[PDB]
Structure formats: C-alpha cells, structure tokens
Amino acid sequence: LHLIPPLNFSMVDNGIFRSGFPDSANFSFLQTLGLRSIIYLCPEPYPESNLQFLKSNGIRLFQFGIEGNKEPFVNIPDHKIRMALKVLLDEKNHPVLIHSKRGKHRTGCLVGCLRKLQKWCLTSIFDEYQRFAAAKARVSDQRFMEIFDVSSFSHIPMSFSCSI
C-alpha cells in the first residue's frame, strides 16, 4: 500500500481536486490523477521539488497568492478568488488540483464559492467547508462565501460537472 494522497485530499467534482501542500511522498499519488493544472493559493514561491514535479509531469501552475491570516484578522481578497474561479471553470484546465498550505481556509473559500455557482444552499456549502476545516473552521471564511457576488459568472456553463 504505497500511495499517499496529500494533506486533506478530496475530489470536489469531475476533474477538480482539493488538498493542502503536496510533498514528494504524495507525487506518485498525484501522478494517478493526470493533472493538467494546479491552482496554488499561497504567495510563497513553489519549492524546487514541487517545481520539478510540475515540469516533469506537464502540469501548469496558476498562482493566486492569498495572505494566510488567522481570525479575527482574516480579509480574503475577492479579486484573487474571482481570478481562480475563472481558471477553475475552464474545463481545458481539468484535471486541476486546488491547494493552499492546509487545504482548509483559502482552498475551502474557493471551493465554497464554486458550490454557490453550482446552486448549493449555504448550510450545505458550510457543512462541506467545516468537514475539512474541523476545529480550525473560520466564521469569516463562511461569511466570505455568504456575501461573494456570483453575478459576473451567471453565463459560464458547467457541463464538466457530475451535477447537471
């Protein structure tokens, strides 16, 4: 039994995955996903180990650096989540792994905003967010999803989804 998914790994939808920061012990597992893209939500430069894996495997890196603040000093930039959603909604980029450091907060917000576009009720979105964030669930992350304006996205169709 040799495959090690990255921290807090899960399948979000057809072609869409979420996790925390992969390390070299996770690379054999990530190869099984046939990734085209990574959406990386931290500002820090990608380590050389991770860069060599991306290059070797023909994976494109999309970096939308969101500062990692703890409650009650969380202030998620709307523009970075919007730019990341535009990448996520283009099926040419699939399969895509979304990751941050822990796969709980920045990752959880992007996934929750996707669920809002998929017409999930807020309590269902928050329950999924909480399943990953567990004892580190942030009310501010859920408030961000509560007020995120989906108006600019209404036209973008999601025929990729398992949910039509």
Numbering used by the authors: 51 to 214
Text of the article:
Subsequently, an intramolecular proton donation by PP-InsP substrate is posited to substitute functionally for the absent aspartate/glutamate general-acid.
The oxygen atom that is positioned at the apex of the phosphate ion’s tetrahedral geometry points away from α4. We denote this orientation of Pi as pose A, i.e., Pi(A). The three other oxygen atoms of this Pi are intensively coordinated by amide groups of P-loop residues Lys151, Arg152 Lys154, His155, and Arg156. The side chains of Arg156 and Cys150/Ser150 also make polar contacts with Pi(A).
